[PDB]
Design a protein around this nucleic acid. Structure first.
Ligand SMILES: [Zn+2]
Ligand SMILES: [Zn+2]
Ligand SMILES: [Zn+2]
Ligand SMILES: [Zn+2]
Ligand SMILES: [Zn+2]
Ligand SMILES: [Zn+2]
Length: 179
DNA sequence: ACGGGCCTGGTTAGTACCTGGATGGGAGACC
DNA sequence: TGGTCTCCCATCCAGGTACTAACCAGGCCCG
């Protein structure tokens, strides 16, 4: 079963490895059986391994990498990095993928991919929807701003005439008053 | 020659959304 | 059964995203 058990009353914890209890104990006490070896740092631990994992940080090492094809960006921990992959490469979730090869990426939504793909072009994604113009954009919000132009009641009198039309009442005049 | 709008390329706060980075707590493979 | 040195996860929290709404100032256009 679980021999080792908390020494304090009420806790009730119990472990099948003295060390497990031993780390739990330090919770009650507040010991630093494994402190760091550098000033400014007062970080403590309860395992000769929870100190090491902290070491690579006092420097900024990246001994672990993202087990994936395309991305080389290494990570600080394995099980940790495992996150990235699943949040990027591993399909099932990020089904839609840019198979343009080399770029090798993916997205949760189809449209999301479509956009990206444009990065392999010369044009921008979110472009102005209307005849003529053709003006394209990146940030949709910015496009929505330009839209304010093609929105009114332009008359039809050959390319010659090409004024828009704020509103019917004002649009009519353009025809009557002018034309 | 002008002044006020209408836009627009260039920027800049204002944010809800994520993402690693760093841990806390322990199973576990072996011996 | 218990050490030892490993290998995972489920999270918590600060730095960085991906855009959006709000500013700014110069180019045109027209009464
Ligand atoms: Zn306890
Ligand atoms: Zn330290
Ligand atoms: Zn990757
Ligand atoms: Zn791509
Ligand atoms: Zn347009
Ligand atoms: Zn007209």
């Amino acid at each position: 079963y679980k021999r080792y058990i908390c020494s304090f009353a009420d806790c009730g914890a119990a472990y099948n490895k003295n060390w497990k209890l031993q780390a739990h104990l330090c919770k009650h006490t507040g010991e630093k059986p494994f402190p760091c070896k550098e000033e400014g740092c007062e970080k403590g631990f309860t395992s000769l391994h929870h100190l090491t994992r902290h070491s690579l940080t006092h420097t900024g090492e990246k001994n672990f990498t993202c087990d994936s094809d395309g991305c080389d960006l290494r990570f600080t921990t394995k099980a940790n990095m495992k996150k990235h992959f699943n949040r990027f490469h591993n399909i099932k979730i990020c089904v839609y993928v840019c198979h343009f090869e080399n770029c090798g990426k993916a997205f949760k939504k189809h449209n999301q991919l479509k956009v990206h793909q444009f990065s392999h072009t010369q044009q921008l994604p979110y472009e102005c929807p209307h005849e003529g113009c053709d003006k394209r954009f990146s940030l949709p919000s910015r496009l929505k701003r330009h839209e304010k132009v093609h929105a009114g009641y332009p008359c039809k009198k050959d390319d010659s005439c090409s004024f828009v039309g704020k509103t019917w009442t004002l649009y009519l005049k353009h025809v009557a008053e002018c034309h």
